[PDB]
Design a protein around this ligand. Structure first.
Ligand code: FAD
Ligand code: FAD
Ligand code: SF4
Ligand code: SF4
Ligand code: SF4
Ligand code: SF4
Ligand code: SF4
Ligand code: SF4
Ligand code: SF4
Ligand code: SF4
Ligand code: SF4
Ligand code: SF4
Ligand code: FES
Lengths: 137, 662, 411, 296
């Protein structure tokens, strides 16, 4: 009756390329994550993550370039600081902060993208349904 | 809004993983969708015709194509959307192949169908909120810059100049030419390197469209495809060219290259052109065939004795108090041609490079064998100056090595140049024998295999075994090379008079600093990265910057020149047009929402944001040319006063909302 | 007299010195600045009615600052946001403003976000041991003290007890006892730790004044060159008397400040663990925030909320007409403010639905602080997201010892 | 005074006791305290026992390590083969979890657990380190110059190799052990192929004595050609090979060298003034008397 709802927000220049490379190389993984594709992860506002979690994302993933490998010289440092602060907010509002993570996937790491997909799915399955969906009523 | 959804089968690549009929029916029942339809190859001419007919018939506001990746087929379907009466940017893709089919092929079909329905729903939600953009066209300055004065830089500069574009040639060293100027002969044809290159050096030095700036570096670069504001450091050469002397007022001239200055200078230092084997004064030229024959002064080693100025006399070319001058130049495109250096092979201690006298590397051997080198072209042993009779060549020295000391790649030309050096010794010293300790002879190019055949015919010994270690005889200074003859099946101990290491090559010194100034990334190997490894080996991901030569990866002089002319052509494409279109992803400030806090200003790596006066209120101002569309500022601004043109917050939030719609 | 001096100060004018809570030095300095034309106006607090009513006042006539003299402990208001809204952010006129610790922190937050001109504003900071809501003070006096509240003349928190002076005598009750019974200082004042505003230009208080001047001298700490100039000018023109402070006074001032820090820590503890942990804290937060009627008083009163239009007003975040509003309303304030919350309590005390906005926000702020090391309201340090640094970002990723941002971040 | 558990394997106590005696005395003279290891055994000798069974090699080396773990001390060694066994098993079991688990459930049959809390040092490594006794401290402790003696160093193989598994730096031409011999006042000489194996490792000493002796004889020829008057070494295996094998070479071949073989601890004792009788130089196959005449 329950299937995890995981949302990914992946940059265009390394994480979308890595997911595309995994697909091209035919690396299988479970069909639980759906992606949004912004240009950089610097674009990811905090309110995007919080909006996802309040609509009912059982998990949220944000994937971007490695440090020093952003297409736009430093846009993922901003995203990293923002996601550290988001981890702190979710812990202090009492939602489980491991529902959220930020992975750094390069353009050539299709295998690592597959492993990230598998691990995110496993972690959310262990965690269970998000509590917001029943706390709303 | 009225959206059309067109679902490609990709010729069973997608229909063999999901139910295309079900996806199409779901798209029909989706809100805002006017028409939903499918085709086998939406990227083909009937597919574009299908899109255009649907647009005309159903009065479509936007188009959603559920197909392969945007990174593969945005231009195709944007042009298909334009041809049909829409804006190109009323279009959005739903990647349901490379992120649904190819990853959910096996044993899971209704799950892939549900994922496809979700992706189509999110794409439709974004496209129902996209609106019209027009790409920005920016003028292109009609100059070009070439950093590097090697063969690849000189070829690119000559190509651009003869195409008519004014070109700057920046070289850090006092002369152009590069490594090929150090080479003595060239494989596979055995031509003299300077003889074949001097004609082209003279062309570069005389061309009216080339601004040859030797002994100069690139301090900083800012700008974009349109205008690059490049600041150059004119290092204190210490000697004036005739033009500069006349400008400063000395009618008698500047430097004519007589040599009296270096005849009287008392300081003696190693010559970097001769890899240190030869002396040169504090005021010097590398070799007698340098293109600007202008006699740099080495200020780190000059003692300001003033004998040089007395020798120069009325020419008055020497200014011992000269300082680093800075110049700012505006250019349209830039070509990077930084070349390479030899990997430090003293780290491989088993081959006693620095510790045994008679172990040298291949550029030192090339200078020793050249007739213009420290010797009279006579190869002699460094230990005692006697002529060798047995010479060993250690191929793969520091290459195809996964131990962390050497390089894991092949340096491409080291098998060929070792064959050349074996030929040169066997023909220059009568009765000398060349031993090549090899592990995969790689003679792949045109006439290379024939060159290999000819060298074996002249009588070089080919021992298939990577050298294990080298011991030096204590008295004769001879070198005992220990390896196994893998084909013979026995260990060997070959005693040679001279050992030559075919060392790996690595990016030149400072190349990483320069490519970070220009915004270029690096490869896995450490060389500069190209836009697409197959179909675009010259351009980089940053627009207006192009690669040429060994700086992108090791190559022979033929391949280097082909790459250099390719880069010159790519750099000429936007200059000849004079216009270039930027991608309309810019940030646009909504002024009657900006509060003027100024906090976003420091979040732009490109300094596109600033605080300015509009209607008395201090608001933020975007230099739309400098913006690159990253979105950092617009993801920061708390009040939502920054709009990202094709990835607006309402659009992204509509995608999120559509994902959670059930 | 020079940027660090600790002084005793009282007013030369006997009437100013009587009406001051201590020696009248804040009212002598403000009067001098106004009448010598350092400043074009003065923003101070005066009683509008009974001493429970504190009304902010812009004063240009130097004859009206004797009315501003005295400290109102029921003045729970915040000044700097009024200067931005109705005095054009002090962008054209110099002001001299008397401010508590929260009012100095708010000045610095708004100056970080470029909403006021601290080059123009002069901040005379007062020590603050806490403020009481006026109506809660009335109920306190009616019930616990057994007095008719209209009888009280003056009332002050001195030595950790609530002294009131009425007709008949004076009384006193320990503020800790009152706070256990459900009265006393405001919640954020119990959690506050900005006791001596050393970020202001002058810090005035009754702590560290000992002996023959225990009620007729103000302890002044000169915290900047601008304050040194104001004090030296006032002393030379003869509106203010200056004697160097007593070292024993300095020592016990330090001890009282430190004890107030410890008490603030204890209340921070008991409150933040009173909110709960895990999914219980989410049900507390969500059930409380389901009461919000979207009056936007918290947004309009917060010093850190400076946006022309709040994102809580944008239809793609919050549905315009749905009144049992989403938790997104308060998530958007936790995301935007919690990194720099000065714990002023205005959001909590202006809420018609009695939602613990300040408690939630400060509970998040304290550990955003121990995570990033950024203390709000102390100086011109840019906000954490307005200044991201390459080396620091590398540092926090390496400290996690991990290839992502997933775990090994908290203890 | 730093304190270390003294492992003391098989050959030093049972064939060359002067080596261990001088080890204790000289280490105490410099600032080091060598404590007996309680019931230590053969470090499962890496060649002759690792060639048979790696799992029992791991188990016995781990037992030797957990003895000193219970002692709460750092191991100090004087043998390159013992260093291989002890240090390398310590390093492997500090990082490989399934091997830790396997060794622990083998050791649980004798009420004994490995947790990986101590470090293993060679005594010459300690003598070379600067925190612990350094080269200057060795020079200070030396009281008899031992001048006018040519001394050839044999590093061995298990101390320094492979360099991807150790931390002693260059294996092609190290000079650190030459500095310790130069501290004593004896001039260390360089010979051809100085980094060659002595031939006794891996059980070859037992399996094919002629092969091992040919490998040793190559070294002895090079050393005599250089002109050495003694061979210092940091391994009782290598000392046994260079000492017995000279006699076996004299009998199986017809080669005579008569080159004394001494452990570095024995030379350090000679430098610090210990007597030849107190060093038990009479227990070596090759007479040390010419070298003693030269340096005394
Ligand atoms: C021993 C040896 C023998 C060889 N023999 C042959 C042969 O026989 N035939 C053959 O075809 N190939 C041969 N090659 C390969 C050949 O040298 C290269 O293919 C060729 O030189 C590539 O030229 P390039 O212009 O790309 O680089 P380079 O020749 O290295 O030129 C780069 C230039 O850029 C300059 N530069 C570097 N960094 C900067 C900077 N930051 N700013 C400004 N200027 C900068 C350098 O000073 C130099 O002048 C040989 C190579 C070696 C090592
Ligand atoms: C609520 C409150 C609590 C305080 N608690 C302490 C404490 O625990 N310990 C301590 O040493 N000092 C405390 N003080 C400060 C104390 O009153 C100082 O000793 C006094 O301000 C010294 O100034 P003065 O008598 O020299 O000048 P005064 O003539 O008293 O000047 C006082 C100034 O403060 C202004 N003011 C009055 N009420 C407020 C208010 N609510 N907000 C802002 N400004 C106001 C007046 O307008 C006037 O300008 C507190 C002050 C307030 C307002
Ligand atoms: S558009 Fe993409 S999915 Fe469709 S046929 Fe072409 S390549 Fe295949
Ligand atoms: S003497 Fe003067 S003109 Fe002649 S080479 Fe030297 S610098 Fe040039
Ligand atoms: S000043 Fe003297 S040292 Fe310098 S270049 Fe001239 S002669 Fe040589
Ligand atoms: S080109 Fe030949 S010598 Fe050079 S690395 Fe490759 S295989 Fe080795
Ligand atoms: S756009 Fe936003 S961040 Fe930038 S100045 Fe305006 S309000 Fe501040
Ligand atoms: S999106 Fe914003 S931060 Fe990025 S380049 Fe454009 S203006 Fe600068
Ligand atoms: S918040 Fe702090 S500074 Fe402000 S009134 Fe309360 S106790 Fe005083
Ligand atoms: S002040 Fe209270 S009721 Fe008003 S918007 Fe804020 S939380 Fe809601
Ligand atoms: S959120 Fe509330 S307590 Fe925090 S600074 Fe704003 S008004 Fe003050
Ligand atoms: S909550 Fe955020 S968007 Fe709204 S006013 Fe405050 S800072 Fe601005
Ligand atoms: S381009 Fe991917 S994180 Fe910036």
């Amino acid at each position: 009756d329950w299937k995890p709802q995981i949302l990914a927000i992946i940059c265009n220049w390394c994480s979308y390329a890595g997911a595309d490379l995994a697909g091209g190389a035919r690396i299988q993984y479970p069909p639980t994550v759906r992606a949004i594709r912004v240009m950089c992860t610097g674009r990811v506002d905090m309110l995007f993550i919080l909006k996802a979690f309040v609509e009912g994302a059982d998990g949220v993933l944000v994937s971007g370039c490695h440090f020093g490998d952003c297409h736009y010289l430093e846009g993922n440092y901003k995203a990293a600081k923002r996601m550290f602060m988001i981890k702190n907010l979710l812990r202090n509002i009492g939602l489980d902060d491991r529902r959220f993570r930020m992975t750094f996937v390069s353009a050539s790491e299709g295998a690592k993208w597959g492993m990230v997909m598998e691990d995110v799915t496993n972690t959310i399955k262990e965690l269970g349904p998000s509590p917001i969906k029943e706390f709303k009523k | 809004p009225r959206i059309g959804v067109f679902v490609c089968h990709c010729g069973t690549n997608i229909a063999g993983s999901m139910s295309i009929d079900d996806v199409v029916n779901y798209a029909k029942t989706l809100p805002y969708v006017a028409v939903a339809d499918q085709y086998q190859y939406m990227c083909s001419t009937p597919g574009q015709k299908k899109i255009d007919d649907a647009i005309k018939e159903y009065n479509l506001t936007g188009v959603v194509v559920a197909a392969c990746s945007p990174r593969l087929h945005e231009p195709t379907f944007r042009t298909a959307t334009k041809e049909g009466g829409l804006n190109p940017f009323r279009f959005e893709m739903a990647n349901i192949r490379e992120q649904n089919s190819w990853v959910h092929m096996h044993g899971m079909w209704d799950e892939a169908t549900q994922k496809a329905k979700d992706q189509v729903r999110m794409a439709v939600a974004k496209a129902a909120k996209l609106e019209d953009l027009v790409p920005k066209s920016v003028p292109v300055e009609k100059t070009a810059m070439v950093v590097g004065g090697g063969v690849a830089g000189m070829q690119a500069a000559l190509d651009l100049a003869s195409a008519g574009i004014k070109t700057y040639l920046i070289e850090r060293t006092p002369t152009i030419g590069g490594r090929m100027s150090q080479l003595d002969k060239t494989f596979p044809t055995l031509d003299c390197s300077q003889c074949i290159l001097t004609p082209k050096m003279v062309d570069v030095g005389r061309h009216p469209n080339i601004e040859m700036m030797t002994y100069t570096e690139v301090e900083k670069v800012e700008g974009y495809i349109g205008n690059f504001d490049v600041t150059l450091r004119k290092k204190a050469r210490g000697v004036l060219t005739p033009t500069e002397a006349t400008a400063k007022g000395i009618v008698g001239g500047g430097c004519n290259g007589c040599g009296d200055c270096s005849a009287v200078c008392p300081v003696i230092k190693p010559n970097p052109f001769e890899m240190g084997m030869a002396p040169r004064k504090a005021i010097y030229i590398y070799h007698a065939q340098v293109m600007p024959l202008i006699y740099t002064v080495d200020f780190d080693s000059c003692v300001k004795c003033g004998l040089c100025v007395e020798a120069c006399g009325d020419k008055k070319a020497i200014d011992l108090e000269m300082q680093d001058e800075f110049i700012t130049v505006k250019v349209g495109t830039a070509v990077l041609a930084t070349g390479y250096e030899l990997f430090p092979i003293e780290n491989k201690r088993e081959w006693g490079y620095k510790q045994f006298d008679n172990v040298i590397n291949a550029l030192e051997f090339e200078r020793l064998i050249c007739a213009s080198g420290p010797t009279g072209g006579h190869l002699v042993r460094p230990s005692d100056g006697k002529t060798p009779m047995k010479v060993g060549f250690v191929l793969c020295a520091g290459s195809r090595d996964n131990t962390g000391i050497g390089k894991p790649y092949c340096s491409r030309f080291c098998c060929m140049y070792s064959l050349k050096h074996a030929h040169q010794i066997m023909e220059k010293i009568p009765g000398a024998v060349a031993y090549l300790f090899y592990m995969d002879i790689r003679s792949f190019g045109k006439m290379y295999e024939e060159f290999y055949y000819r060298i074996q015919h002249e009588g070089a010994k080919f021992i298939r075994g990577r050298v294990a270690n080298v011991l030096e005889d204590k008295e004769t200074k001879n070198l005992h090379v220990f390896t196994e003859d893998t084909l013979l099946g026995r260990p060997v101990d070959v005693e040679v008079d001279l050992l030559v290491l075919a060392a790996a090559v690595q990016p030149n010194e400072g190349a990483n600093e320069l490519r970070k100034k220009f915004g270029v990334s690096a490869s896995q190997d450490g060389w500069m990265l190209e836009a697409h490894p197959k179909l675009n080996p010259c351009g980089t991901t940053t627009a207006g910057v192009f690669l040429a030569g060994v700086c992108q990866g090791p190559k022979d002089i033929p391949d280097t020149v082909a790459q250099a002319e390719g880069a010159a052509s790519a750099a000429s494409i936007p200059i000849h047009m004079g216009e270039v279109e930027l991608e309309p992803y810019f940030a646009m400030c909504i002024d009657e929402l900006c509060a003027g806090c100024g906090m976003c200003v420091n979040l732009c790596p490109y300094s596109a944001l600033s605080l300015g006066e509009k209607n008395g209120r201090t608001v933020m101002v975007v230099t739309e040319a400098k913006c690159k569309g990253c979105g950092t500022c617009g993801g920061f601004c708390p009040g939502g006063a920054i709009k990202m043109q094709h990835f607006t917050t309402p659009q992204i939030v509509a995608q999120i909302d559509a994902f959670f719609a059930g | 007299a020079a940027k660090g001096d600790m002084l005793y100060a009282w007013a030369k004018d006997a009437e100013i010195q009587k009406k001051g809570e201590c020696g009248g030095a804040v009212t002598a300095l403000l009067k001098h600045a106004l009448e010598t034309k350092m400043v074009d106006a003065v923003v101070a607090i005066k009683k509008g009615k009974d001493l429970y009513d504190a009304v902010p006042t812009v004063i240009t006539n130097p004859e009206d600052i004797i009315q501003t003299a005295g400290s109102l402990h029921c003045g729970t208001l915040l000044i700097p946001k009024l200067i931005k809204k109705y005095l054009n952010g002090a962008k054209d006129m110099k002001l001299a403003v008397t401010c508590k610790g929260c009012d100095a922190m708010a000045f610095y937050e708004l100056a970080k976000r470029n909403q006021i001109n601290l080059d123009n504003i002069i901040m005379i900071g007062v020590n603050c041991g806490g403020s009481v809501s006026p109506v809660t003070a009335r109920k306190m006096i009616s019930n616990k003290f057994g007095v008719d509240p209209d009888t009280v003349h003056k009332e002050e928190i001195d030595k950790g007890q609530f002294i009131i002076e009425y007709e008949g005598g004076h009384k006193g009750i320990k503020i800790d006892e009152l706070e256990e019974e459900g009265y006393g200082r405001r919640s954020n004042c119990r959690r506050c730790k900005m006791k001596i505003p050393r970020q202001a230009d002058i810090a005035a208080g009754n702590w560290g004044v000992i002996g023959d001047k225990a009620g007729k001298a103000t302890f002044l700490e000169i915290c900047s060159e601008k304050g040194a100039n104001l004090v030296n000018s006032a002393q030379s023109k003869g509106a203010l008397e200056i004697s160097p402070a007593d070292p024993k006074g300095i020592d016990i001032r330090a001890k009282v400040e430190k004890a107030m820090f410890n008490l603030g820590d204890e209340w921070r503890h008991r409150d933040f663990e009173g909110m709960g942990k895990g999914k219980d804290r989410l049900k507390l937060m969500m059930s409380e925030s389901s009461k919000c009627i979207k009056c936007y008083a918290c947004v309009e009163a917060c010093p850190i909320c400076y946006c022309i239009e709040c994102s809580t007003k944008k239809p793609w975040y919050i549905a315009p007409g749905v009144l049992p509003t989403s938790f997104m309303f308060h998530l958007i304030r936790f995301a935007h403010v919690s990194d720099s919350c000065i714990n002023c309590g205005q959001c909590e005390e202006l809420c018609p639905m009695e939602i613990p906005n300040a408690l939630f926000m400060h509970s998040q702020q304290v550990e955003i602080e121990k995570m990033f090391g950024h203390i709000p309201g102390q100086d011109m340090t840019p906000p954490i997201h307005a200044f991201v640094e390459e080396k620091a970002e590398r540092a926090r990723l390496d400290a996690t010892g991990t290839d992502s941002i997933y775990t090994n971040i908290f203890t | 005074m730093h304190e270390y558990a003294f492992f003391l394997g098989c050959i030093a106590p049972n064939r060359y006791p002067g080596c261990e005696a001088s080890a204790i005395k000289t280490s105490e003279k410099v600032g080091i305290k060598l404590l007996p290891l309680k019931g230590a055994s053969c470090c499962p000798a890496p060649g002759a026992f690792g060639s048979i069974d790696l799992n029992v090699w791991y188990a016995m080396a781990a037992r030797n390590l957990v003895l000193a773990e219970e002692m709460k001390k750092d191991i100090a060694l004087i043998c390159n083969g013992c260093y291989k066994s002890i240090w390398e098993v310590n390093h492997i079991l500090k990082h490989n979890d399934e091997l830790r688990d396997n060794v622990n459930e083998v050791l649980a049959e004798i009420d004994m657990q490995f947790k990986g809390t101590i470090d293993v040092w060679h005594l010459a490594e300690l003598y070379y380190d600067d925190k612990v006794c350094g080269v200057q401290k060795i020079k200070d402790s030396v009281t008899t110059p031992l001048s006018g003696a040519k001394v050839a160093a044999h590093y061995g193989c298990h101390l320094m190799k492979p360099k991807k598994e150790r931390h002693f730096g260059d294996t092609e031409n190290p000079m650190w052990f030459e500095e310790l011999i130069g501290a004593l006042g004896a001039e260390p000489i360089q010979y051809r192929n100085k980094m060659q194996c002595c031939g006794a490792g891996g059980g070859v000493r037992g399996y094919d004595i002629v092969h091992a002796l040919d490998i040793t004889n190559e070294k002895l020829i090079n050393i005599q050609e250089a002109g050495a008057d003694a061979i210092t070494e940091l391994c009782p295996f290598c000392q046994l090979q260079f000492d017995r094998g000279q006699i076996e070479i004299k009998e199986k071949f017809g080669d005579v060298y008569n080159i004394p073989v001494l452990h570095y601890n024995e030379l350090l004792g000679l430098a610090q003034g210990m007597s030849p009788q107190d060093l038990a130089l009479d227990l070596h196959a090759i007479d040390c008397t010419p070298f003693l005449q030269k340096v005394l």
